[PDB]
């Protein structure tokens, strides 16, 4: 039970879900802030939302209704649902250079001022779309600088706590980093909101990793798995689906490329449309990606795999018929003495205008603290634990040391 | 290749996007089509060179896509991607080294590939100077072209030596370059980038 374990009381009529959207006119001077809400319970005519957005302690909108929004099909609509819409004049973005955030209200109430019960979130503004063959964040490309990161504490092994959070993004940007993908399953919920507030990008991730299959491609593919599999990406989605610093969605990791990969994709292009989606199994451009995303994919040399070769970064985009961004998901491995090249990669990104980057694997050791004879700590790894089978320092690819410390 | 050639004007358009010289471009590239187009050598149609881009490109190889489908047409000027080539052709363009020149910049050309919106197949019409005591880094290409799909290799520029024979005070000859007739303005070894010497016999 690593992760927090919670009560939560709620009144019988309750908020259920909710959900903020955020459109923009072409320069960016003008938004529109879109709220849906659903409920739960007893829908009663004298009941009512508000939905307020704040900009510290200043009311920058605020909009009330009732339940019930439009027609959907031939059966009509849904009464326990309403939309709002906001309209925002000259809206303060938010971006991983300035994470300018508001705060957004949602209220539960009757038509008499009684409040039942208020939820909320901090929305920020920004706008993800690839076009044209390029990834842009708010109408400019970008430049990811980023790193693959674990949940990883030497002493609590995979428990976290916001101090450990809190280091680790300080370290990230006094680093020059952008962006942090999850590697490779939902991370602890403050995460998101940290980086929210303090700024990265975050490519969330499905927690599903089927690498020792054979074909890696066998559970993916079958049917059987769909609803398992499903379970993995819907809910992470109905859960970190109004995060700011959530910028690209990933199917998971390293599970090759099966029919349930492209149901899943299409599933979520249809839920929510404001974020591409990428998955890098079954060779790095499948139709369940958005974005090509290889690791380990040299700059300038091919690694010609059978089935699923490795182009050259700068090669894998030209091919015929390619026009998708490329922005690396692993790259780099950097376990211990290493990091030759990194300079290559840094000035291709910079030369390759659809060549946007990459994520560094990884940010921490995933060594663990042992004792000795003397009650003298020791970092241990691999089979240290009698543990079989294992593959020892392959869990030491880390830019700084379980402590945090620093690789050079 | 068409016989239209106006480098020498500022800018390089100045006719070949004036209506008035429609008429006679116009006349290079018909008649040049209906005398050749039985040919199955002949596999690309060019408008001409550096000439820069005119909308009297654009109608010229608007005729010949509709008159002869059977081929592809090509020109460089204006910046090798114009609109009016059905490939990317510049001269020069460097493997790994971009020259982004105002208006018509010269990217490396595994970099031009992936331009965003870029989707057509690049074949260098001029590359490697084969200027005196040159054809230095001429494999770097060839490796290009064998590891890129969409370099379809190019034209070496260019075969021949330009030079021209005289005779001396003993009626023995030799091999004459610009402005060596009194030719004024003149080039001078400019006209010799050749493979081969103007006998045929070969460069190193």
């Given at each position: 039970?690593?992760?927090?374990?919670?009560?939560?009381?709620?009144?019988?009529?309750?908020?259920?879900?909710?959900?903020?959207?955020?459109?923009?006119?072409?320069?960016?001077?003008?938004?529109?802030?879109?709220?849906?809400?659903?409920?739960?319970?007893?829908?009663?005519?004298?009941?009512?939302?508000?939905?307020?957005?704040?900009?510290?302690?200043?009311?920058?909108?605020?909009?009330?209704?009732?339940?019930?929004?439009?027609?959907?099909?031939?059966?009509?609509?849904?009464?326990?649902?309403?939309?709002?819409?906001?309209?925002?004049?000259?809206?303060?973005?938010?971006?991983?250079?300035?994470?300018?955030?508001?705060?957004?209200?949602?209220?539960?109430?009757?038509?008499?001022?009684?409040?039942?019960?208020?939820?909320?979130?901090?929305?920020?503004?920004?706008?993800?779309?690839?076009?044209?063959?390029?990834?842009?964040?708010?109408?400019?490309?970008?430049?990811?600088?980023?790193?693959?990161?674990?949940?990883?504490?030497?002493?609590?092994?995979?428990?976290?706590?916001?101090?450990?959070?809190?280091?680790?993004?300080?370290?990230?940007?006094?680093?020059?980093?952008?962006?942090?993908?999850?590697?490779?399953?939902?991370?602890?919920?403050?995460?998101?909101?940290?980086?929210?507030?303090?700024?990265?990008?975050?490519?969330?991730?499905?927690?599903?990793?089927?690498?020792?299959?054979?074909?890696?491609?066998?559970?993916?593919?079958?049917?059987?798995?769909?609803?398992?599999?499903?379970?993995?990406?819907?809910?992470?989605?109905?859960?970190?689906?109004?995060?700011?610093?959530?910028?690209?969605?990933?199917?998971?990791?390293?599970?090759?490329?099966?029919?349930?990969?492209?149901?899943?994709?299409?599933?979520?292009?249809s839920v929510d449309p404001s974020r591409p989606v990428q998955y890098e199994g079954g060779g790095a451009d499948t139709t369940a990606t958005?974005?090509?995303?290889?690791?380990?994919?040299?700059?300038?040399?091919?690694?010609?795999?059978?089935?699923?070769?490795?182009?050259?970064?700068?090669?894998?985009?030209?091919?015929?018929?390619?026009?998708?961004?490329?922005?690396?998901?692993?790259?780099?491995?950097?376990?211990?003495?290493?990091?030759?090249?990194?300079?290559?990669?840094?000035?291709?990104?910079?030369?390759?205008?659809?060549?946007?980057?990459?994520?560094?694997?990884?940010?921490?050791?995933?060594?663990?603290?042992?004792?000795?004879?003397?009650?003298?700590?020791?970092?241990?790894?691999?089979?240290?634990?009698?543990?079989?089978?294992?593959?020892?320092?392959?869990?030491?690819?880390?830019?700084?040391?379980?402590?945090?410390?620093?690789?050079?």
């Amino acid at each position: 039970i690593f992760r927090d374990v919670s009560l939560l009381h709620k009144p019988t009529t309750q908020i259920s879900d909710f959900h903020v959207a955020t459109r923009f006119n072409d320069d960016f001077s003008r938004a529109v802030l879109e709220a849906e809400v659903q409920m739960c319970g007893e829908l009663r005519d004298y009941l009512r939302v508000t939905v307020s957005l704040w900009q510290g302690e200043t009311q920058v909108a605020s909009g009330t209704a009732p339940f019930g929004g439009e027609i959907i099909d031939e059966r009509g609509g849904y009464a326990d649902r309403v939309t709002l819409r906001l309209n925002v004049e000259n809206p303060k973005l938010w971006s991983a250079e300035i994470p300018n955030l508001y705060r957004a209200v949602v209220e539960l109430h009757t038509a008499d001022g009684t409040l039942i019960e208020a939820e909320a979130c901090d929305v920020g503004f920004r706008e993800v779309r690839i076009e044209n063959g390029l990834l842009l964040l708010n109408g400019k490309p970008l430049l990811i600088r980023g790193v693959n990161r674990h949940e990883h504490h030497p002493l609590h092994g995979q428990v976290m706590d916001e101090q450990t959070m809190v280091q680790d993004i300080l370290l990230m940007k006094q680093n020059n980093f952008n962006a942090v993908r999850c590697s490779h399953y939902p991370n602890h919920p403050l995460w998101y909101t940290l980086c929210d507030r303090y700024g990265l990008y975050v490519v969330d991730e499905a927690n599903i990793e089927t690498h020792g299959m054979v074909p890696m491609n066998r559970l993916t593919d079958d049917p059987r798995w769909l609803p398992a599999m499903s379970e993995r990406v819907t809910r992470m989605v109905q859960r970190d689906r109004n995060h700011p610093s959530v910028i690209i969605w990933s199917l998971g990791n390293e599970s090759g490329h099966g029919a349930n990969h492209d149901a899943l994709y299409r599933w979520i292009k249809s839920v929510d449309p404001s974020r591409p989606v990428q998955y890098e199994g079954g060779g790095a451009d499948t139709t369940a990606t958005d974005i090509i995303c290889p690791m380990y994919a040299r700059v300038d040399e091919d690694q010609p795999f059978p089935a699923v070769p490795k182009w050259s970064i700068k090669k894998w985009l030209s091919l015929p018929g390619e026009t998708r961004p490329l922005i690396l998901c692993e790259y780099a491995h950097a376990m211990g003495n290493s990091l030759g090249g990194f300079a290559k990669y840094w000035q291709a990104f910079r030369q390759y205008p659809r060549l946007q980057g990459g994520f560094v694997w990884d940010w921490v050791d995933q060594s663990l603290i042992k004792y000795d004879e003397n009650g003298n700590p020791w970092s241990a790894y691999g089979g240290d634990f009698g543990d079989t089978p294992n593959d020892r320092q392959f869990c030491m690819n880390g830019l700084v040391f379980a402590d945090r410390t620093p690789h050079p």
